[PDB]
Design an enzyme around this catalytic site. Structure first.
Site, PDB file in Angstrom:
ATOM      1  N   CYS A 108      -4.789  -6.711  22.646  1.00  0.00           N
ATOM      2  CA  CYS A 108      -5.134  -5.297  22.695  1.00  0.00           C
ATOM      3  C   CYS A 108      -5.496  -4.791  21.301  1.00  0.00           C
ATOM      4  O   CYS A 108      -4.702  -4.929  20.365  1.00  0.00           O
ATOM      5  CB  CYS A 108      -3.944  -4.520  23.262  1.00  0.00           C
ATOM      6  SG  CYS A 108      -4.328  -2.804  23.554  1.00  0.00           S
ATOM      7  N   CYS A 187      -6.034 -10.698  33.258  1.00  0.00           N
ATOM      8  CA  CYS A 187      -6.812 -11.575  32.389  1.00  0.00           C
ATOM      9  C   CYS A 187      -6.227 -12.972  32.267  1.00  0.00           C
ATOM     10  O   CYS A 187      -6.930 -13.867  31.801  1.00  0.00           O
ATOM     11  CB  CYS A 187      -6.937 -10.950  30.997  1.00  0.00           C
ATOM     12  SG  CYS A 187      -7.972  -9.490  30.987  1.00  0.00           S
TER      13      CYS A 187
HETATM   14  N1  LIG Z   1      -1.710   5.134  21.693  1.00  0.00           N
HETATM   15  C1  LIG Z   1      -2.969   5.032  22.156  1.00  0.00           C
HETATM   16  O1  LIG Z   1      -3.447   5.931  22.822  1.00  0.00           O
HETATM   17  C2  LIG Z   1      -3.781   3.828  21.880  1.00  0.00           C
HETATM   18  C3  LIG Z   1      -5.143   3.836  22.208  1.00  0.00           C
HETATM   19  C4  LIG Z   1      -5.891   2.700  21.951  1.00  0.00           C
HETATM   20  C5  LIG Z   1      -5.270   1.603  21.386  1.00  0.00           C
HETATM   21  N2  LIG Z   1      -3.989   1.619  21.075  1.00  0.00           N
HETATM   22  C6  LIG Z   1      -3.437   0.386  20.496  1.00  0.00           C
HETATM   23  O2  LIG Z   1      -2.819  -0.358  21.569  1.00  0.00           O
HETATM   24  C7  LIG Z   1      -1.829  -1.245  20.992  1.00  0.00           C
HETATM   25  C8  LIG Z   1      -0.519  -1.117  21.772  1.00  0.00           C
HETATM   26  O3  LIG Z   1      -0.172   0.267  21.776  1.00  0.00           O
HETATM   27  P1  LIG Z   1       1.374   0.439  22.184  1.00  0.00           P
HETATM   28  O4  LIG Z   1       1.688   1.949  22.138  1.00  0.00           O
HETATM   29  O5  LIG Z   1       1.596  -0.135  23.598  1.00  0.00           O
HETATM   30  O6  LIG Z   1       2.227  -0.440  21.131  1.00  0.00           O
HETATM   31  P2  LIG Z   1       3.508   0.237  20.414  1.00  0.00           P
HETATM   32  O7  LIG Z   1       4.276   1.291  21.351  1.00  0.00           O
HETATM   33  O8  LIG Z   1       3.107   0.821  19.118  1.00  0.00           O
HETATM   34  O9  LIG Z   1       4.555  -0.967  20.198  1.00  0.00           O
HETATM   35  C9  LIG Z   1       4.122  -1.827  19.149  1.00  0.00           C
HETATM   36  C10 LIG Z   1       4.812  -3.182  19.348  1.00  0.00           C
HETATM   37  O10 LIG Z   1       4.533  -4.034  18.226  1.00  0.00           O
HETATM   38  C11 LIG Z   1       5.793  -4.593  17.799  1.00  0.00           C
HETATM   39  N3  LIG Z   1       5.768  -4.957  16.385  1.00  0.00           N
HETATM   40  C12 LIG Z   1       5.327  -4.193  15.344  1.00  0.00           C
HETATM   41  N4  LIG Z   1       5.476  -4.848  14.228  1.00  0.00           N
HETATM   42  C13 LIG Z   1       6.022  -6.062  14.488  1.00  0.00           C
HETATM   43  C14 LIG Z   1       6.399  -7.167  13.709  1.00  0.00           C
HETATM   44  N5  LIG Z   1       6.237  -7.152  12.336  1.00  0.00           N
HETATM   45  N6  LIG Z   1       6.918  -8.225  14.323  1.00  0.00           N
HETATM   46  C15 LIG Z   1       7.081  -8.252  15.635  1.00  0.00           C
HETATM   47  N7  LIG Z   1       6.743  -7.242  16.408  1.00  0.00           N
HETATM   48  C16 LIG Z   1       6.217  -6.144  15.878  1.00  0.00           C
HETATM   49  C17 LIG Z   1       6.825  -3.463  18.034  1.00  0.00           C
HETATM   50  O11 LIG Z   1       8.127  -4.058  18.081  1.00  0.00           O
HETATM   51  P3  LIG Z   1       9.349  -3.064  17.697  1.00  0.00           P
HETATM   52  O12 LIG Z   1      10.054  -2.662  18.938  1.00  0.00           O
HETATM   53  O13 LIG Z   1      10.351  -3.899  16.762  1.00  0.00           O
HETATM   54  O14 LIG Z   1       8.866  -1.754  16.914  1.00  0.00           O
HETATM   55  C18 LIG Z   1       6.348  -3.042  19.440  1.00  0.00           C
HETATM   56  O15 LIG Z   1       6.875  -3.972  20.386  1.00  0.00           O
HETATM   57  C19 LIG Z   1      -1.614  -0.780  19.534  1.00  0.00           C
HETATM   58  O16 LIG Z   1      -2.243  -1.696  18.635  1.00  0.00           O
HETATM   59  C20 LIG Z   1      -2.301   0.603  19.479  1.00  0.00           C
HETATM   60  O17 LIG Z   1      -2.815   0.840  18.169  1.00  0.00           O
HETATM   61  C21 LIG Z   1      -3.230   2.676  21.305  1.00  0.00           C
END
Ligand SMILES: NC(=O)c1ccc[n+]([C@@H]2O[C@H](COP(=O)([O-])OP(=O)(O)OC[C@H]3O[C@@H](n4cnc5c(N)ncnc54)[C@H](OP(=O)(O)O)[C@@H]3O)[C@@H](O)[C@H]2O)c1
Ligand SMILES: O=C(O)c1ccc(-c2nc(-c3ccccc3Cl)c3sccn23)cc1
EC number: 1.5.1.30
Length: 204
Positions: A108, A187
């Site tokens: 993603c 996928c």
């Molecule tokens: N928000 C939106 O509307 C939107 C739109 C388009 C795209 N996106 C993208 O979609 C993707 C997923 O979004 P999301 O909200 O589902 O993800 P998220 O809520 O931000 O969760 C991020 C995940 O990455 C893990 N992580 C971060 N750093 C890490 C590390 N150093 N080692 C291991 N794990 C790590 C976090 O673990 P922890 O629990 O330890 O923090 C968490 O499980 C992101 O890249 C975001 O930028 C978001």
């Protein structure tokens, strides 16, 4: 068919529902988490838990070993500061997949990689910059890579009824986190999206 999968980012917004749906569907799921306290204590739970950091190659290597495919849902939660966690994490994942002979990765990033760069909101540019870096790492890896590029991620219900637009922007600007997770797992069951960018979206 795909049976064993590793999920990175399983404790995040999309990761948690992707994890639950994967277990519901019968996958043997391995997760890499920074803290097992952020995994659910009841309900669908992963078969294997590695506690560690995606920035530690040894932690990524032991997570990817033995898998049929990999799902990447890494992110920065609400932190919009400059970062290289996702692209550096992707480098470690690619290296581990190559070492272990895993060839399928569904990752993603964001629909902003499909936007006119003059239109990307400046406040989201720093995160988008590392999405670009991560996409480059995965596209250049030569692995079977599905580039999932969602618009805004909402908390609407699971529907399974979303539209999947290939190699361009789609007609809605929202996808529910549950539908995004559903699509990531879809996928794993087909190669028809390999090497494409995919934009899941729906009207709720
Ligand atoms: N928000 C939106 O509307 C939107 C739109 C388009 C795209 N996106 C993208 O979609 C993707 C997923 O979004 P999301 O909200 O589902 O993800 P998220 O809520 O931000 O969760 C991020 C995940 O990455 C893990 N992580 C971060 N750093 C890490 C590390 N150093 N080692 C291991 N794990 C790590 C976090 O673990 P922890 O629990 O330890 O923090 C968490 O499980 C992101 O890249 C975001 O930028 C978001
Ligand atoms: O195509 C679209 O309409 C669309 C695509 C992507 C996003 C997006 N929202 C966020 C975000 C916002 C607030 C707090 C945390 C985060 Cl992570 C980020 S970071 C990289 C992209 N985005 C929004 C809309």
């Amino acid at each position: 068919a795909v049976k064993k999968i590793a999920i990175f980012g399983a404790t995040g917004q999309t990761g948690l529902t992707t994890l639950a749906q994967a277990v519901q569907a019968g996958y043997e799921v391995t997760v890499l988490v920074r803290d097992s306290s952020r995994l659910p204590s009841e309900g669908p739970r992963p078969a294997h838990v590695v506690v560690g950091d995606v920035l530690q190659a040894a932690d990524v290597d032991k997570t990817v070993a033995g898998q049929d495919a990999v799902i990447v849902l890494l992110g920065t939660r609400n932190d919009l500061s400059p970062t290289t966690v996702m692209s550096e994490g992707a480098r470690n994942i690619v290296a581990a997949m190559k070492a272990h002979g895993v060839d399928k990765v569904v990752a993603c990033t964001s629909a902003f990689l499909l936007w006119d760069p003059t239109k990307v909101p400046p406040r989201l540019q720093a995160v988008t910059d590392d999405h670009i870096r991560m996409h480059k790492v995965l596209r250049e890896s030569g692995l079977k890579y599905v580039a999932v590029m969602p618009p805004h991620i909402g908390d609407q219900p699971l529907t399974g009824a979303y539209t999947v637009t290939l190699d361009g922007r789609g007609p809605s600007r929202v996808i529910s986190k549950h539908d995004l997770g559903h699509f990531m797992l879809r996928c794993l069951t087909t190669d028809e999206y390999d090497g494409h960018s995919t934009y899941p979206s729906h009207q709720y």
